[PDB]
Amino acid sequence: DNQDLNGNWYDFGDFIQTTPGSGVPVVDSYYSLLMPILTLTRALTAESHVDTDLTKPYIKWDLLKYDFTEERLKLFDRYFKYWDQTYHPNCVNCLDDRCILHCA
Amino acid sequence: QMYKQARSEDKRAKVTSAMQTMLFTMLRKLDNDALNNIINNARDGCVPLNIIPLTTAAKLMV
Amino acid sequence: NNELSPVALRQMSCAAGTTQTACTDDNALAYYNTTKGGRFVLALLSDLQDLKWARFPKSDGTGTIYTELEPPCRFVTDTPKGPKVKYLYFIKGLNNLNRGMVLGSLAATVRLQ
């Protein structure tokens, strides 16, 4: 509720100050509450284009490609950079059944 | 109870010879010039199955 | 009004280690959270600048454990009596919430510039 519908932020009244270089953004009820809206509104539909531009044509992928692990780890860094929990693109490296549910 | 152990083995030999007569008739049908040309351009030899009829088939049904 | 740690924490005691091996009897200091669960110290500090692992004592009998550290971040941490440099390593594997409570308690309620 402190980010209007343009992306601008604005209540800095419950923030503390530390030594520069060590700041801790706590984003865990911001991403989790927002999650069901990221697929209803189809947010990441501009990532299928040739420069992430909704005007330029689609990306023509190699037809024999099936891994997509180096592009799954680059989509996590671009939008969920400060989400502090290990993300396993292939859930065969997960640690229990509460990690499979997180990483899937 | 021994006629029934015989019956079943005779039957086990009639299905074991029917799947064999299939997996060797659906194999003589692979234009192995257009199929060994994508298993070769593959990084390790694994390809998705959804692109085999799409790039190595001779007939189309619409 | 999401507030971080609306109630403060306490406790500072015991030791930890500097030489994965040594941790002879007294090395560095552990900070906070008796942790309802039992004992879970959130953060760690030191008077020195060399600490790889730390056998920080804990309850029961198997209290010995390698409470190792990670790349630190130092602060002036001016003691009210005078200046004193203290390098803050965080417990390996701490999450952004706990490092918020720790930082909030030892900075806003303590004398740091």
Ligand code: BEF
């Ligand atoms: F988030 Be308000 F400025 F208390």
Ligand SMILES: [Mg+2]
């Ligand atoms: Mg507000």
Ligand SMILES: [Zn+2]
């Ligand atoms: Zn996982």
